RNA sequence: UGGCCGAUGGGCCCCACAGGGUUACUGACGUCAGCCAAACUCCGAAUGCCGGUAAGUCCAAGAGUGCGGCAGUGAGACGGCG
RNA sequence: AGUUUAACUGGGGCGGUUGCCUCCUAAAAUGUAACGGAGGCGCCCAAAGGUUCCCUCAACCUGGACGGCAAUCAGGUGUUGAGUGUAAGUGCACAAGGGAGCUUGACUGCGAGACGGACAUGUCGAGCAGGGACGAAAGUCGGGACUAGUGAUCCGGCACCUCU
RNA sequence: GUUACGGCGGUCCAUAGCGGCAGGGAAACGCCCGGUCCCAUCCCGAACCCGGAAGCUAAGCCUGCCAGCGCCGAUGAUACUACCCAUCCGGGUGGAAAAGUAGGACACCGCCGAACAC
């Protein structure tokens, strides 16, 4: 499987741990499209940063 | 003029009032009672005044209760002293109250007179309140 | 002085090896103890001074 | 008006210092408890000041037995 | 009609026996190579077990109950000496030589001392 | 805070060494129930932290730790949270 | 004549404090201020140390008389509600609580590794060599149940040495 | 193999404790009989220790039964809270208590050693 992740809100003024998790995801600038594996761990990542990202599911 | 007659220490920190009043949330003892609405302080003077208002009108029949008791002290630094230099001295005692608490409890024959007395008690109280009966 | 200051010496040695404090008011008799001091290499009672 | 309070102590920084399942080496301290909040177990030493440590490499393991708290070290298998 | 208004001597006695054995048991860390030798004495018999606390399982034991040892008309010093010799030789057969002794809650002296000695000069070094 | 037997206020109208607050008191204990506590906890989390494993950003953050040259700063403010 | 005459401070001054220890504030790792809330320390100890052994209360009903509400008691529910050198917290009945016997480990030189420290320091610690202590032995013994009872450097005094 | 037996043991040590009731002496267990010799009473053979088994299981122990009390404990809800929010004002997802409630419940199990049977 695969996931399309795109940050929809800026990182500014967000909890430091959330910012670091965003870096882990690998989104530098707002509205970047990134493809990632559908693991439980990345699912948890998206769940945590859900208020900043939208998920489009591919495959 | 209710006051604890001895405690471990004569002063206490500021309060947290957040939270719904759980203790005594339902009338039990008599057959009628008040129930407050909003968080607030209640001074010993206020409690005593309400007790007088209830009692003197009810006169002979029935007997009252007071589910609360002002315990926590308070202080206010006298005027003309730049703030600092330690805690002030205690002035009055207050009993906390949370939404839904029952303040007074009555067992008198007639609902009308019970309501009337408790209404005067409400008017003399500092925070909103309303009648409530024993029923489920 | 509430708690005087006492030294202890070996016999063959005579070396101020151990020092300890006492209440002279309640102990007017001199202190005796069996202990060790290194150089003569074996235990031996130490005296007061 | 004057205050008679306002003095305090130092901060000894007590508390458990190697947590359950960690890997500790010989002579390693485990806890610093004023009272006997815990109790020694096999391969644990009772310090001069109610402190707990380990007398052999291994992984620390807490556990309740007889309704108390006692620390112990399981020697991790030699690779 | 019986109404208890106090405590009981024998009950507190058994509790105290367990208590006092507890001090030593606390320390004892006796493995297969160094099992703990437990001694129990009755008003009529003596019992001894050699166990490794690691598994809480015994290795060898004997007591005044066995018919051959009861065949000894003597008293409990002699009974204890014979039983201790049996423990020693059974432990030797099983292949254990160095062990630790448990005071079994009783104070040393008399029958316990006789058992200890018998075990000592029977070849059981502990 | 309000109730219950309450002998015995652990005690009183005559003190008999013996009947009643024959008298409204006190009534201890305990028990029925209803609150309160930063220095009370027979209870007890989401969080935070430390330890182990695994995936990911791995044309590098420009990630960490140590050592070495360099100065600043040790007058904070506000807002949200306790 | 050359100089000294503190800081903290909700402006200064007068008051009070200046180090150390306990708890709370402290947001369940540590830590975390205030002239915030509350209390103590500048010791004691040849035993109140070590070890071996014995044993465990207080609460409880009754009183040959003093003697009583309480002095000592035993019968026979008895689980710390009593206590544990000096405050509080943490612990403590498997005792850290008493008694006794003995006796000095309140040893000597080191110290695997750690804890805390901005730094100087401060804390814990299994094992190794001599000797000793208690216990037949197993083992425990490097000060007190722990956490306060403290002072750097210089200058000087005193003893021993296979230093010059 | 059974046992209405004794020691040692276990266990996020009370579902395992306490209370009342009934029953056990073949062996073992207790109580028990007496203190020359061991040993002890800060006096006492009360404790311990020692010699013996005349007696009895009342006490204690054990087992069985009782829900009187302790005790464990749902689902559900409520309190609480991580993160985010909308011009305060409380909701969205995640986490999910305490107490109370139906209920459960008068321990289970390991190794050896004793009486009946093989
Ligand atoms: Mg508040
Ligand atoms: Mg608060
Ligand atoms: Mg009002
Ligand atoms: Mg010296
Ligand atoms: Mg502190
Ligand atoms: Mg209630
Ligand atoms: Mg609290
Ligand atoms: Mg606590
Ligand atoms: Mg925290
Ligand atoms: Mg980890
Ligand atoms: Mg780069
Ligand atoms: Mg550099
Ligand atoms: Mg520079
Ligand atoms: Mg500065
Ligand atoms: Mg500054
Ligand atoms: Mg500043
Ligand atoms: Mg600041
Ligand atoms: Mg400001
Ligand atoms: Mg802020
Ligand atoms: Mg000049
Ligand atoms: Mg100034
Ligand atoms: Mg000012
Ligand atoms: Mg001024
Ligand atoms: Mg903390
Ligand atoms: Mg600061
Ligand atoms: Mg003082
Ligand atoms: Mg001693
Ligand atoms: Mg008695
Ligand atoms: Mg002691
Ligand atoms: Mg004692
Ligand atoms: Mg080293
Ligand atoms: Mg040696
Ligand atoms: Mg040592
Ligand atoms: Mg010491
Ligand atoms: Mg010590
Ligand atoms: Mg100088
Ligand atoms: Mg028989
Ligand atoms: Mg006798
Ligand atoms: Mg019976
Ligand atoms: Mg009995
Ligand atoms: Mg319970
Ligand atoms: Mg039960
Ligand atoms: Mg559920
Ligand atoms: Mg937000
Ligand atoms: Mg709003
Ligand atoms: Mg629950
Ligand atoms: Zn010498």
């Amino acid at each position: 499987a695969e996931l399309k992740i795109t940050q929809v809100r800026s990182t500014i003024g967000a909890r430091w741990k959330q910012r670091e998790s965003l870096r882990t995801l690998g989104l530098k600038k707002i509205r970047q499209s990134v493809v990632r594996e559908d693991n439980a761990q990345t699912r948890g990542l998206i769940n945590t940063v859900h208020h900043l990202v939208e998920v489009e599911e591919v495959g | 003029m209710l006051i604890p007659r001895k405690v471990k220490h004569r002063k206490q920190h500021h309060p947290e009032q957040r939270g719904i009043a759980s203790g005594g949330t339902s009338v039990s003892f008599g057959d009628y009672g008040i129930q407050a609405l909003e968080h607030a302080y209640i001074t010993n003077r206020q409690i005593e005044s309400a007790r007088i208002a209830i009692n003197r009108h009810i006169k002979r029949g029935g007997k009252v209760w007071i589910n609360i008791f002002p315990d926590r002290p308070l202080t206010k630094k006298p005027a003309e002293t730049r703030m600092g230099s330690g805690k002030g001295s205690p002035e009055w005692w207050v009993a906390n109250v949370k939404p839904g608490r029952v303040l007074f409890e009555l067992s008198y024959p007639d609902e009308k007179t019970a309501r009337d007395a408790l209404t005067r008690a409400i008017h003399k109280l500092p925070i909103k309140a309303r009648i409530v009966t024993r029923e489920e | 002085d509430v708690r005087p200051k006492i030294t202890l010496a070996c016999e063959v040695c005579k070396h101020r090896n151990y020092i300890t404090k006492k209440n002279r008011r309640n102990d007017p008799d001199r202190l005796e103890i069996k202990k060790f001091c290194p150089n003569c290499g074996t235990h031996q009672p130490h005296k007061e001074s | 008006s004057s205050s008679r309070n306002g003095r305090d102590s130092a901060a000894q920084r007590l508390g458990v210092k190697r947590f359950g399942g960690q890997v500790v080496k010989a002579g390693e301290i485990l806890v610093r408890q004023r009272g006997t909040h815990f109790h020694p177990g096999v391969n644990v030493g009772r310090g001069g000041d109610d402190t707990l440590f380990a007398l052999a490499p291994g992984a620390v393991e807490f556990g309740a037995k007889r309704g108390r708290k006692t620390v112990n070290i399981v020697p991790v298998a030699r690779p | 009609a019986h109404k208890p208004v106090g405590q009981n001597i024998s009950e507190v006695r058994r509790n105290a026996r367990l208590r006092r054995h507890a001090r030593l048991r606390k320390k004892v860390a006796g493995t297969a190579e160094v099992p703990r030798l437990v001694v129990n004495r009755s008003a009529r018999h003596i019992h001894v077990q050699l166990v490794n606390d690691l598994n809480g399982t015994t290795l060898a034991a004997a007591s005044s109950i066995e018919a051959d040892v009861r065949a000894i008309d003597g008293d409990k010093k002699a009974h204890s000496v014979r039983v201790g010799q049996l423990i020693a030789e059974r432990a030797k057969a099983a292949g254990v030589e160095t062990v630790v002794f448990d005071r079994g809650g009783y104070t040393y002296g008399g029958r316990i001392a006789a058992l200890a000695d018998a075990a000592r000069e029977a070849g059981l070094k502990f």
Side-chain angles (χ1 to χ4, degrees), chain B residues 8-9 11-13 23-24 29 63 65 71 101:
Chain B
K8 274 192 271 223
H9 42 256
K11 337 206 203 206
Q12 303 214 0
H13 301 166
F29 274 28
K63 95 172 202 163
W65 284 265
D71 67 14
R101 203 165 190 41

Side-chain angles (χ1 to χ4, degrees), chain A:
Chain A
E2 258 324 271
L3 288 206
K4 314 322 311 303
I5 299 333
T6 48
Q7 147 183 79
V8 62
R9 316 269 306 300
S10 34
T11 84
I12 288 284
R15 224 63 217 173
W16 170 55
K17 95 173 61 163
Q18 273 144 10
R19 171 161 341 139
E20 260 274 22
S21 87
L22 166 39
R23 144 61 170 161
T24 287
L25 271 283
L27 278 41
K28 325 185 159 187
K29 48 218 182 314
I30 177 187
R31 200 194 267 181
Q32 187 170 11
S33 287
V34 62
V35 61
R36 293 311 164 161
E37 293 55 26
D38 175 349
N39 326 63
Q41 141 179 66
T42 298
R43 201 43 64 104
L45 281 207
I46 301 320
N47 155 288
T48 326
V49 171
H50 97 287
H51 63 71
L52 294 200
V53 305
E54 77 179 350
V55 52
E56 312 155 14
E57 292 175 353
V58 178

